[PDB]
Every structure is written in C-alpha cells, then in structure tokens.
Amino acid sequence: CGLVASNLNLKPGECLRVRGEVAPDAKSFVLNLGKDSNNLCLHFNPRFNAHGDANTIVCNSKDGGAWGTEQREAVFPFQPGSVAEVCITFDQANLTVKLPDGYEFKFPNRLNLEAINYMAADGDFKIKCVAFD
Amino acid sequence: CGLVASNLNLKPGECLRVRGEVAPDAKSFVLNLGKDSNNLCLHFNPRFNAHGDANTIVCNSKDGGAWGTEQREAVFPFQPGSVAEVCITFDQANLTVKLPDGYEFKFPNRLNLEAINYMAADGDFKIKCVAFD
C-alpha cells in the first residue's frame, strides 16, 4: 500500500500535483482523493492490464462507503516504465484531471466536501513528488 | 493540524525533501518523523519565540509514547515569512538534517529505525512540496 496523506486542506481552485514512476510491469495504479477512505470524490484508476481492461482509465466516487457509478475515459497517456505527472483541481461541480500528453478531463464532484483532506496511492506507481501548489 | 503522511517507506540514505512556507508571525513549527505518531525518531522543532526559547532548534525522540531528552542545536537559519527547505536522511546511527543556507546537523537514531514511514507537520510552517530521492 502506498502513500497516504491527510489534513491536506486542498481548497477549490488549488492544484494537487503528483509525480511518480510507473513500474515496467505495471498492471494498474490508483490515486484516491476525498475526505477519508470511505468518502472519495475521486478514485482515479489507470488500468494497463487489470480486471480484463487494457489501457483504460476507470474513475469513480465513494460516498459513505458506497461506490458510485463508474466512468471510463477514452485516452490513456501512460506507459509502463516511465515517469508520469497527474494534476488535479476541483470546484463544486467537477474535478479537473490533467494528465501527460496534453490530455485533460472532468469528473463530476458527487460529494459535498469543503476541501480535499485525504489522498491515498496504491498499485504500480512509485510516488516521487507531491506538491500542493 | 498540518499535513500527516504515512507509508512513506523512506529507507537509509534516501532523501526526504520538504519545502514549505514559514508563517509571517511564526513562533514555532514542527516536523515529526518516525514509525507512527507514538514512535518518533525526529521531532524537529524550530522555535522563533516559544517555550522560553528564542531562535533555537529543539530536537527530540518519542519511544512508545514517552519523550526522550531534548537536544538543542547551535544554528538557526530560518526567518518568519519566508520559504524554507529541509532535507532529511538517516542511517543506523543518526539522522542528518540539512537546513537552509548550507547548515546541517545530526541527531542520534535513538529508536534504531530502519525505515521512516510517518511524517507530520504542525505549527507555523505550511508544507508546499514533499519529494523523495
């Protein structure tokens, strides 16, 4: 299990940046953002080869323990064995996820959080740097 | 109150780099490192004006909830209302803390930790970036 951070106090409009190494044999990794492990405004899960999925980003929310409706993106700007940076902001409507290779997408903000206080990383991504603008 | 991180998986010789903002009205800040919140190999407490100390770094350990004996350092390269970087590494014998302006000091590794998994900030220092070398 990877880096867990709490008390982040990330306010709307502020940018969370995470840079890490994707393993040469990576199958998937996860970056969870929210209030705590049961309350995630973003579960961000690039799947290189996991759960039957190939090169697909899976996103979801979790509210009071309950997973929301999953959504898949259609661009996969990650490569095993390379460094990748992810930048996330939010407002009350949406989280904006900025990825490598110019790609950006929005994910609806389905929870009611004043700030993002919790990050957790897991899977085949070694975190090298985290910046809170 | 400040950032709390766990599962850092810092190993001997690896560098933990923490950059942050020293508050304009700064009186004291803390970085705690260790196994968990009850087992600290380093409580790093620059005191601008706090607990009877002026411009003094106080260091301590905490072992199973019990504070150790404080050590007072000889240098103070911090200023209120500035950005500062601290770099920490450790080995079997000591932690090495590198400070602004080319200062450094050693603090004994009293707990004989082989890994640092926990970091917490408090006080008048706002963490802006954390990096792992």
Ligand SMILES: CCCO[C@@H]1O[C@H](CO)[C@@H](O[C@@H]2O[C@H](CO)[C@H](O)[C@H](OCc3cn(Cc4cccc(C#CCN)c4)nn3)[C@H]2O)[C@H](O)[C@H]1NC(C)=O
């Ligand atoms: C048409 C029916 C199909 O329905 C399927 O139903 C599954 C749930 O039963 C979904 O799967 C869940 O989907 C959820 C979001 O919605 C979540 O991703 C969740 O995982 C949580 C989780 C697990 N982990 C641990 C971890 C993770 C990755 C690496 C490692 C490692 C390693 C070595 N270093 C460890 N962290 N978070 C996942 O299991 C499938 O998507 C879904 N497929 C679809 C809908 O087409």
Ligand SMILES: CCCO[C@@H]1O[C@H](CO)[C@@H](O[C@@H]2O[C@H](CO)[C@H](O)[C@H](OCc3cn(Cc4cccc(C#CCN)c4)nn3)[C@H]2O)[C@H](O)[C@H]1NC(C)=O
């Ligand atoms: C004078 C005679 C008596 O002797 C004093 O006795 C005190 C208590 O035992 C020692 O002080 C304790 O020293 C310990 C290390 O040994 C620890 O630093 C501990 O603080 C734990 C702590 C508290 N926080 C929270 C936090 C952090 C920074 C900012 C704020 C704020 C604010 C807005 N008001 C809050 N994080 N860690 C400290 O209280 C003094 O050194 C000592 N002085 C001496 C012996 O000469």
